[PDB]
Amino acid sequence: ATPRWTREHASKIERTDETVVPIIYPPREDAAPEINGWDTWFLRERDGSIATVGGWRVIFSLTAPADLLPGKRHDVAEIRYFYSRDGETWFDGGPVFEGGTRGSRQWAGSALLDDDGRLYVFYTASGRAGEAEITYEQRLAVGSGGSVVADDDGVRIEGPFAHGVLLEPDGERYEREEQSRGMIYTFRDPWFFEDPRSGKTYLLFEANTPIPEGAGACGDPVWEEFNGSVGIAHSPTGDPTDWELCDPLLEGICVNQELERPHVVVRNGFYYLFVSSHDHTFAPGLEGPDGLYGFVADSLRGEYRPLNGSGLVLTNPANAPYQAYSWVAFSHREELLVSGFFNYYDLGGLTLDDVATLSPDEQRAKFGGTLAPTVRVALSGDRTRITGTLSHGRIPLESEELPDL
Numbered sequence: 407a408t409p410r411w412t413r414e415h416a417s418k419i420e421r422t423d424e425t426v427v428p429i430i431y432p433p434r435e436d437a438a439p440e441i442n443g444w445d446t447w448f449l450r451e452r453d454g455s456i457a458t459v460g461g462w463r464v465i466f467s468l469t470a471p472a473d474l475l476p477g478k479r480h481d482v483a484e485i486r487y488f489y490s491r492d493g494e495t496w497f498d499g500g501p502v503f504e505g506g507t508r509g510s511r512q513w514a515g516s517a518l519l520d521d522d523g524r525l526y527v528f529y530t531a532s533g534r535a536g537e538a539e540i541t542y543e544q545r546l547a548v549g550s551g552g553s554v555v556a557d558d559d560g561v562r563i564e565g566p567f568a569h570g571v572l573l574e575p576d577g578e579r580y581e582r583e584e585q586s587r588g589m590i591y592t593f594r595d596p597w598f599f600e601d602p603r604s605g606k607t608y609l610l611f612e613a614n615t616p617i618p619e620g621a622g623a624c625g626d627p628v629w630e631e632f633n634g635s636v637g638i639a640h641s642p643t644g645d646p647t648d649w650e651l652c653d654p655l656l657e658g659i660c661v662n663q664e665l666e667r668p669h670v671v672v673r674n675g676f677y678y679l680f681v682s683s684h685d686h687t688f689a690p691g692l693e694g695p696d697g698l699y700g701f702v703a704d705s706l707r708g709e710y711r712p713l714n715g716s717g718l719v720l721t722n723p724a725n726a727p728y729q730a731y732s733w734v735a736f737s738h739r740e741e742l743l744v745s746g747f748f749n750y751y752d753l754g755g756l757t758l759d760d761v762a763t764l765s766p767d768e769q770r771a772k773f774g775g776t777l778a779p780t781v782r783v784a785l786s787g788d789r790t791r792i793t794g795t796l797s798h799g800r801i802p803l804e805s806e807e808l809p810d811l
């Protein structure tokens with residue numbers, strides 16, 4: 407009886423003052439002019455709070471060379487780590503992995519500094535290492551057995567890394583590459599999460615739920631190609647490397663193919679489930695923007711209902727509709743903070759497919775490749791409201807006071 411984001415929900419999607427972020431302007435200097443960075447995630451403790459080692463926060467980003475064409479960054483994505491004392495001025499720590507990383511390239515995941523001090527960097531293994539032609543095979547992997555050393559000079563991630571595949575789609579609850587109808591299947595973005603109530607350990611991910619041909623599972627056969635879902639796995643032992651697949655938390659069948667970078671924020675007594683999604687990944691008959699969509703339930707595996715009636719929590723303005731993507735929500739005292747990356751700006755009207763037309767120079771310099779100004783939002787049951795913004799990629803601790811409104 408899997409909770410569903412319905413077409414009746416998506417029909418109501420609409421930009422409002424409460425969901426539209428201000429215009430993102432490029433930052434005054436680049437932390438790494440040589441590197442474009444997107445899809446960023448935080449080094450968290452087991453409960454999910456932002457980890458702090460010797461006064462440093464650590465974050466992870468997908469990175470590619472700046473001189474590389476934006477549209478192709480996905481084929482050569484490499485995980486770099488950055489560290490900061492304040493939350494604003496990040497230092498490049500370089501690549502996280504020195505060795506046998508899984509897949510031809512690495513896609514987004516999450517990071518855990520366990521109570522025992524062991525580091526787990528969950529990532530998506532895209533393709534297979536040293537493949538001839540690029541494949542779009544996605545498997546949830548981890549680089550376990552890391553050490554995080556912090557002096558007063560910086561942070562180094564050291565020691566031998568142990569790389570292993572954690573999960574591949576079953577074929578019943580989560581669609582495999584073979585079963586993929588319509589657009590390319592999804593099985594990526596592993597996000598670690600300890601339920602503060604049960605104490606049980608889970609791993610959320612983006613998947614697709616298989617729909618047999620002629621199933622009539624939808625009011626139009628073409629719509630059933632859009633079978634995006636938020637999958638979850640459980641660790642009985644709590645070991646961050648031992649997982650068993652569970653039933654999906656939420657399905658967007660007949661609505662959207664890509665329910666990207668799923669994550670849960672628990673607030674007072676409620677579970678808010680957030681997913682980033684594209685306008686181009688919407689089923690026909692539906693019109694929604696690139697945005698963060700959100701659902702709420704009284705339990706982690708509960709009857710999720712969409713925030714603001716439609717599910718749209720946060721989106722870009724009409725006149726810069728691709729300026730940010732890959733938003734991650736996290737709690738700060740009484741606020742919710744949301745950090746995306748600075749995506750595509752100054753298009754003048756152009757669609758994403760049209761950007762590929764432009765000269766290499768004209769394509770670079772319509773791409774930020776930095777952290778977006780982190781948005782401050784207020785949750786009010788099943789209703790959300792944008793309250794303001796902070797500096798570009800400010801990730802503060804709960805111990806830090808934010809500017810007044």
Ligand SMILES: OC[C@H]1O[C@@](CO)(O[C@H]2O[C@H](CO)[C@@H](O)[C@H](O)[C@H]2O)[C@@H](O)[C@@H]1O
Pocket residue numbers: 445468480483513514515530594595664666667684731732
């Ligand atoms: O680069 C992989 C990384 O990007 C995300 C979020 O931006 O997905 C993007 O790239 C995928 C692969 O090309 C596309 O399928 C998707 O449309 C696009 O949003 C994450 O899902 C992933 O971790």
